[PDB]
């Protein structure tokens, strides 16, 4: 494997949230999203017809995988993880199985995952994928319809507005037709995938969890899978803020905490609550000392840019880090 050895010593990674949600940028008809701008479709129950039409305005002229990967490399990040497809159900790659994707639906007409995969290969960074394997707001039988007992960063976990008939929904339809095929797609194209990032099942069955584990193993034998997929089908445990030293057995000794620079994963115009360089550097050092990789999220803006203050704070966090390691 020795992908295991590399992950123990990686320490630092860039995460990217980017999708149709990025264009709305935390705002819908003069009202604010929750802290999570990427959840805006659920928050305002925006009809798929309307939300999907955002694709017609997706033309990020300043997107540049080379420049993004370079920034990651300059901050000493050793891997990059991207949203291939979030809860909204929109793919950021050229999906054969669903035309609801950046390549087919947008004037941009380009494979974002492909460009990042290539930028990473040439730069010598490992490449990881995020995929929402349970929630899909574009799919009539998207997940979450049997677990609205608990509150969300939107309204409901499922698209309950376009598809209200909760007692006639069947996730198997969504899983077989979109979910598994799309996982096969991202895991076969775009070369070696170092890390695989799934959500916690609400809907997805035990069988269906095992299936995704097998699929990834067969197509990407070196790919490290994160705890979220399901118990006993992972190679590193993803820890939440509430789980970090001042429980899920991890047999390989591999741990990763994800966070954002501000309070949103997706870009949000109103969210300027950027963690200071010192906060970023200190948290990284704290996580690293406990043998935990820091996966730090950038939410790209409508033109596909790292926000100015996100870049500034990553670079100043790097200078504080280097200064401290010289002492």
């Amino acid at each position: 494997n020795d992908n295991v050895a590399w992950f123990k010593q990686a320490k630092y990674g860039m995460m990217i949230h980017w999708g149709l949600y990025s264009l709305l940028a935390g705002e819908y008809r003069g009202e604010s999203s929750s802290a999570y701008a990427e959840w805006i479709q659920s928050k305002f129950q925006i009809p798929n017809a309307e939300y999907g039409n955002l694709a017609t305005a997706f033309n990020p002229l300043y997107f540049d995988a080379k420049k993004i990967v370079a920034l990651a490399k300059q901050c000493g990040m050793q891997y990059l993880v991207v949203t291939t497809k979030h809860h909204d159900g929109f793919a950021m790659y050229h999906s054969k199985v669903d035309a609801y994707n950046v390549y087919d639906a947008t004037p941009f007409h380009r494979d974002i995952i492909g460009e990042l995969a290539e930028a990473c290969q040439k730069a010598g960074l490992k490449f990881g994928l995020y995929y929402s394997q349970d929630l899909d707001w574009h799919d009539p039988n998207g997940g979450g319809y049997k677990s609205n007992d608990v509150e969300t960063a939107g309204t409901t976990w499922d698209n309950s507005w376009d598809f209200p008939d909760e007692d006639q929904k069947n996730f198997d339809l969504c899983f077989d037709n979109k979910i598994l095929p799309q996982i096969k797609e991202i895991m076969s194209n775009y070369g070696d995938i170092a890390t695989a990032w799934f959500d916690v099942p609400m809907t997805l069955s035990e069988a269906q969890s095992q299936t995704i584990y097998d699929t990834v193993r067969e197509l990407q034998p070196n790919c490290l899978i994160n705890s979220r997929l399901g118990n006993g089908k992972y190679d590193f445990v993803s820890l939440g803020d509430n789980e970090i030293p001042k429980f899920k057995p991890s047999p390989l000794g591999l741990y990763e905490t994800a966070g954002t620079i501000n309070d949103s994963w997706g870009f949000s115009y109103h969210d300027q609550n950027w963690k200071t360089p010192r906060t970023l550097y200190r948290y990284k050092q704290h996580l690293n000392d406990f043998g935990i990789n820091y996966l730090l999220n950038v939410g790209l803006d409508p033109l596909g840019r790292v926000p100015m203050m996100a870049e500034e704070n990553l670079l100043a966090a790097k200078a504080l880090e280097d200064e401290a390691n010289r002492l």
Copy 2:
């Protein structure tokens, strides 16, 4: 022209800055614009080739002149003034004379000035136009090339990067071919224009100032022109805040400002004047017989920023509350 009487009593107006600059939103290649985001092309000397290409990404799905004018009406604004064409040289209307415009250059493929003109006619709001009659960064002979002695919200007043040869530039070429024709266009289409908003000439000759005055008078006899055009060719003086006490023959005055510190949308500028600040300034200007022209900088999807809307509406509630007492 009872337009004079109406302006004395108007008290409040919406101004709109919107253009290609709105898409960059105060940011270029990881660096910040000045307080003035609309000046970003000059600030970073962005080649016309590149800046112009922003047009290919201009698709403001949420633009809605009816909803914008409704907001203006609800805040008790009696007129609306829009950027037809700013220093960058990009027209926000269907220009016959230049294809560098929202209708021809953008997937949106719609006349912004036309939609606002109509929304205003139906809502019963007077309609005013802003036009950069001197500065044009898209025109080889754009203005400002004989007055870089003074600092700007960008680098230079003219496009000195695409068109460096300052000693072979001739503003007459730009004026005759783009400026005057475009003024004729905006003043003839889009119905009655109540207010005309020009910049202070740096380059534009005395003759050329008189020409624009005549053109507006002949096409829009009721249209009130602002002091900026040149001395003795105006009907109201536009005041800066630093010029109100404690040279206008009609007794008509107007101070323009923005809610934050930028005229164009700027995602880094969240320094919104509070409702109380907005309401108090309006009351101060009105008591001195000065119309408050308050700018909204629409975002890439053609939306009034959430906090701009909130603060206009809360300023209105403070104002109404105070008039009930």
Copy 3:
């Protein structure tokens, strides 16, 4: 006790956090408190010797109970609830039982609770008290030493730095000697208390919960007590926002919140809820028959922060506007 009828229809109340924590204002030796600035002594384990010395610098020249209650009245708040004594153990009234209080320890040399109680009586506002009946960081046997299993807005629930010997601490000593006497003090002086606001017991026994209930009932028979004290010793349930839909026999409910993210004043916390957010939340809570208890964290000079005042007043104007429609 028509106090029940009055609380069902009260709808809106001011809450006040104020203490030694207010002087540090979210900051200690170049580092930030948590969202809760009032928790700063626990957050940085500041020795009582040092923290207590803040009392020597407590001289809020601009404190004015009349002006504070007037603001509350102008926003249509019908009651006011104050911190008599928070987790830090410092009394904001002239306590016979402990000299660790605003009157005895500070150059200000005045009873804050007394001035507010009087300002409220004269203004026609009901007066409520908050008291930390379990946690006391100044008391060797302060509460929380048997429940550090769970994380806090500081470090530990108890003062574990000045008083580390957890296995030789006895809350009974603190309860008998400081807690019950101080409750007797605040409930006997300062006239009628409409609302009594306690914390959730971590340490405090079943007996000790019943005792406080009895004490309040005997001294203040009209006083409505909140659920936090313990099950079956309350007259209204204090709800968290996450517990309102889409266990109270009198039908009385109250949700408390702050304008920014801190209860105590925090100079770094400028995340003020907009007027619209405040007005809408109030309307939402009121429609569900829930009183909105909205916290102000007074600053070192005893002032309502400028933006807290602005946003309460603008929230009031939005509310009045909406009721006129």
Copy 4:
């Protein structure tokens, strides 16, 4: 002199604004000061009776000249300049001539200038003084009463509210009785003064300008005086933002631009518009390349602390600077 040689190569200095204005912290009776919080007494025409009473609440428990000078030293600042007395007329040293001072008027009962002077001597930093030699809002005949033709960061340049009789004011009374004696005081006590920082005369006569120049020369022969005092009585020209490369002859080749981290010189609770580390570092490098010392102001808070974000941004600016000089 070779104080001249040292100033050419100093590059960086800390400035401190601190006074009664610091306690109000940009706010008076629910209304905001201008960008300049230190100007608040003029802005709201606060009677001397009331403003002066702030002295009774001045007890900055966390003031620590050693820690302040240490921070300055860690950022590579080579000198420290303090407000001995600002426009409000309140001395921050033990003045024999006026009891309106930190030592006599406040429960703190300590000489701030003295503690900083000592902290600097022991740390090996040069020590400089600011003094408002024209404006004094506490003095009946304070300056500015013949130049209200122009707007200010308050209302008027002079105290025109406590002392309205403009046509019966005489600056000579103020100059002879308070100004010159206080300059003699600060220049004789607190040891060697490296830099002397005066305001531009509005009121102060040509004679009176020459007098202050002579006084400083006789008491502090090595002390470099800044252009503001008056034409031909200075050793370095202080440049404003509008005067810095993309005029006052400077014969020694010595230049200094002062600025603050946020938009206020005095502490202001509402002013969180902190210049980012990159902005601070870049400006410093720009000024230094043009042979201009950067004098960067900290506005101490009511407890005598460097604001958390001021400290963080100075330290991160230092790390960016060191990183860039390694390359």
